[PDB]
Symmetry: D2
Subunit: 256 residues, 4 copies
């Protein structure tokens, strides 16, 4: 019960890493605000997670909030306060990676990736931190960045800057919000088999090349990110802020 | 003559680091395209630099190009090809840092910082890389990032993500453009006394705190970045791509 | 019970970060091997920790093992197998930092710092990894590195290379041992008020300079590292290997 | 003539990266002290380089100095002062990497790698910096570290800590020696085809895997490191200290 009586907001929590984090936080005692994109599949996934959490004795609510809408942060916080009376943890997880080459990158596709992954995160973090500061009990903010915050991707020239920007946002927010006991950290998943790279890793030569580079011998799954996220949200991480935590089975270090 | 016959574009080169970099590139034999913001001061400063360069026997032109206008990249490249027949080096330097607290950051100021520093850089790099690819001669791209791509700033939560983003962009572009011999690197200046921090360091307590943290015992000046940029643009760096270079007098490493 | 039934070795655990880490590991259900330096104070402190652990219902033993003696690794492992029948976690914590200027560093002091902090750690990791490999159950190795693996210290030119070395050792061991399910990570404490810096921070000007640089507003205490070490040793971190975790209150990121 | 009238010492300069750096520094005007191991091949290679430098109008001398002998630093400095009256640049390049697995790593092989690569470097840097400080004209120190200071190697568990330690030594020495105008930086070669990895890359499956990961499409050669080293030794790098410079053709960043 590492998160008992904490209100946790998770953005883009209908599937993948965010769904697994939302589910494990509820298992750890937290009252979970399941943020979703507002699409048909997003809403359906958030409600089925809320149903699942209800089934094992936890509390959760679903709240639509398009991350590219810079006003959805305050919507999430308002709903969290209505249902649960506080905001104590923000897991900023919503993000997209539409694989695309650099020289013909459309302006709209680039702007949508920065808008969803970084700009919307900035103002979602801003709204949650505002509430945490008003409450005066401290707080915990976790950004789902990437190994690709540290290294490049040829088909991700529009995406890796948003993941690096998210990490840097956590570093700067750690200074700004430290005096209020609000801890700001980034988690950096490696290659996690999810919808975001289902088509990409359908190329079995690329899948094998990537898997061979993982010392632990497997790609990740969403639950691999739940423990790290719960840790960073918990009192186990009471002196951890401004930090980066790679969760990649050793992918980053494996040069030879 | 480290850059003899090369055509170099420098964005935002009317003053500061960009002015010093364009000046030294022309001293090294380059034909320089002095890009500027299109404002009155930017026009005047670009034109006086062109006057100065022609005086000591170089060639240069001044070209207005708002970095926040995502179409200025193709305009700078077109002016470069029209004048000098090639684009061989891009120094992406234009940038703003309007210091501002985090919790009351207005969306317009945030969006202009990301648009100028990161989005405009993306499409300027794209335009210049497209031309370098067509020529078949390789090339060099240098982004002026910052020490603040590695560490935070409480009044720079909107700014440090753009500097981290630029660094990550060089890393991903290094991969996408490597097959075409286009090297992409970031230079990370420390605290350089320029217009961007004139007001900020007018507080003498912060000025001493920052200065006494520099092992070399002084803040930087624009000419301190000219050597490292020329190096990265030159054949001295033929095997350097996807790299970061701190030019900060030791400021980053100095904990105690 | 995050570590229930696991056998944990902590080196240098008579005081400081190691003492707090061994205590919390036993609180989490682990059978702890409290390694110590073999000195009189180290023996006494290890024995009183064993007394305290048995008191609240845990199991532990005290084992003398000079980290600078490169054969103590096999001695710690042998004592662990003899007492508890397995080795499942190694927390390599033993270390010295005799502050000293660079240009007059004596070879004996340099060589003892590298021998204790790095060489002894290498062969302790080797002994413990050999046993984990034989068992076929996986395992976890955590090296106590430092923020000073990322930044410099003028009176620590002999010390920071050992902390950087430990981090790099975890990265390379993560690759070599990944196929055997042994995860290797570094934890990077910031400025933790302990015996190692009691004299150094007795200068109140440096103490304030360091403290005011911590966004969380305080220096750390040994218990601040217990949570992060337990996390890295637990199944919460099943996909974490070859990673670094700053536990520093934001000190690393705080430039301005 | 970036290094005219500077005395440059290069350790382990009989072949590979160090030979190419020694040769290019002499082409840039410097008076070069060609340090070598003192073996038969080391001495023969240093004299043939000195002969080559004589042939194109430069000045150089050969000086035997086993890097694992902690007293050879002062021997190098004494000889540099005798011949050329000053020490102005130190390129610490001597190093070994005897590929070997971790679990059966012999103690002697480990201690020889740390002794040659890190401990000997510490006291060679110490001797050169002592002379530079006495002279009062500033100086430049460059350590040849590695990409493997940033990432792991399964057969390099004994070696990557020495490369990371060298980088960290430069960071700490930058603080300690900054007030004397002595700049301390690390260069990080990627995979450079030399004697150190001739046997390793004779496995063409490993060679192809490594080469495919290089965006620039080739492994390095020694001359690829000469420009970066000359840059860091020159006034072009006047504000560069405590820095790391990757020279790897994009190897590090190329995840996908
Ligand atoms: N899977 C990996 O390998 C990997 C690695 C590193 C980082 N990440 C990051 O993990 C995070 C989650 O991605 P994932 O791997 O679980 O893949 P995913 O596609 O399964 O999940 C993406 C989540 O974000 C939601 N989302 C998308 N756009 C949204 C919007 N405008 N507003 C609100 N929610 C939105 C999605 O509906 C979904 O729930 C992303 O930020 C991604 O950048 C993934
Ligand atoms: N001064 C430092 O300490 C420091 C440190 C690291 C990085 N940087 C970066 O260096 C670069 C140059 O900054 P500086 O220190 O010379 O300050 P500066 O304000 O004196 O120069 C900024 C330049 O960018 C131009 N510019 C601003 N907006 C523009 C726009 N929309 N379009 C085109 N040009 C525009 C400006 O006209 C100016 O010439 C910036 O990107 C900055 O982020 C500065
Ligand atoms: N205190 C900090 O700010 C800080 C920050 C980062 C890393 N560290 C590292 O944390 C670890 C513990 O340091 P601490 O802060 O608790 O200081 P400490 O001096 O109180 O504890 C050091 C422990 O290591 C033991 N030890 C010393 N030499 C030994 C030897 N040859 N053999 C076996 N044990 C030996 C000591 O007996 C002691 O228990 C060290 O490795 C240190 O480098 C400390
Ligand atoms: N080749 C690469 O891929 C690569 C990559 C990164 C870093 N490095 C580093 O580059 C440096 C030079 O290695 P290299 O690639 O040129 O291979 P190399 O084997 O051809 O050169 C090694 C040099 O160091 C000398 N040397 C060895 N032991 C010595 C000793 N005790 N005393 C004095 N000199 C000694 C050698 O005689 C030789 O001149 C090393 O420090 C290496 O760790 C190499
Ligand atoms: C799409 C996804 O993005 C992640 O940040 C990482 O780069 C993974 O490798 C990729 O599969
Ligand atoms: C989802 C769950 O998360 C927990 O932290 C646990 O320790 C495991 O890591 C994982 O199975
Ligand atoms: C505005 C300028 O931005 C730089 O990136 C760095 O943070 C400097 O310290 C600051 O003065
Ligand atoms: C502007 C000029 O740039 C050159 O590279 C030179 O070496 C110096 O660093 C500086 O004065
Ligand atoms: C001795 C101790 O070492 C740590 O690694 C860090 O540098 C702390 O600041 C110092 O107090
Ligand atoms: C020692 C203990 O460790 C636990 O992880 C807990 O969460 C706290 O951080 C600390 O008080
Ligand atoms: C031996 C040599 O060592 C270098 O540091 C690097 O790791 C290269 O890949 C390797 O070939
Ligand atoms: C050895 C020589 O070094 C110089 O700096 C030159 O620019 C090239 O990089 C290389 O051919």
């Amino acid at each position: 019960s590492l998160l008992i009586d904490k209100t946790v907001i998770v953005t883009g929590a209908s599937r993948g890493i965010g769904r697994a984090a939302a589910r494990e936080c509820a298992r750890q005692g937290a009252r979970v605000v399941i943020g979703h994109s507002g699409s048909d599949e997003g809403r359906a996934g958030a409600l089925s997670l809320a149903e699942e959490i209800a089934a094992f004795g936890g509390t959760a609510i679903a709240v639509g909030a398009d991350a590219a809408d810079l006003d959805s942060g305050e919507k999430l916080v308002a709903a969290a306060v209505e249902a649960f009376g506080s905001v104590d943890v923000l897991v900023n997880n919503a993000g997209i990676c539409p694989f695309h080459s650099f020289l013909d990158m459309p302006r709209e596709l680039y702007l949508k990736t920065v808008g969803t992954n970084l700009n919307g995160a900035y103002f979602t973090v801003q709204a949650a931190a505002r509430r945490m500061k008003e409450q005066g009990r401290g707080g915990a903010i976790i950004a789902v960045s990437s190994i690709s915050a540290l290294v490049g991707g040829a088909m991700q020239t529009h995406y890796t800057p948003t993941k690096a920007g998210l990490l840097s946002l956590m570093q700067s927010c750690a200074i700004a919000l430290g005096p209020y006991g609000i801890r700001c950290n980034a988690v950096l998943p490696g290659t996690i088999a999810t919808d975001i790279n289902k088509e990409d890793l359908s190329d079995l030569e690329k899948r094998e090349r990537m898997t061979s580079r993982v010392p632990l011998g497997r790609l990740g799954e969403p639950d691999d990110l739940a423990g790290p996220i719960v840790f960073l949200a918990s009192d186990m991480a009471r002196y951890v802020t401004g930090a980066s935590l790679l969760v990649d089975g050793g992918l980053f270090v494996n040069l030879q």
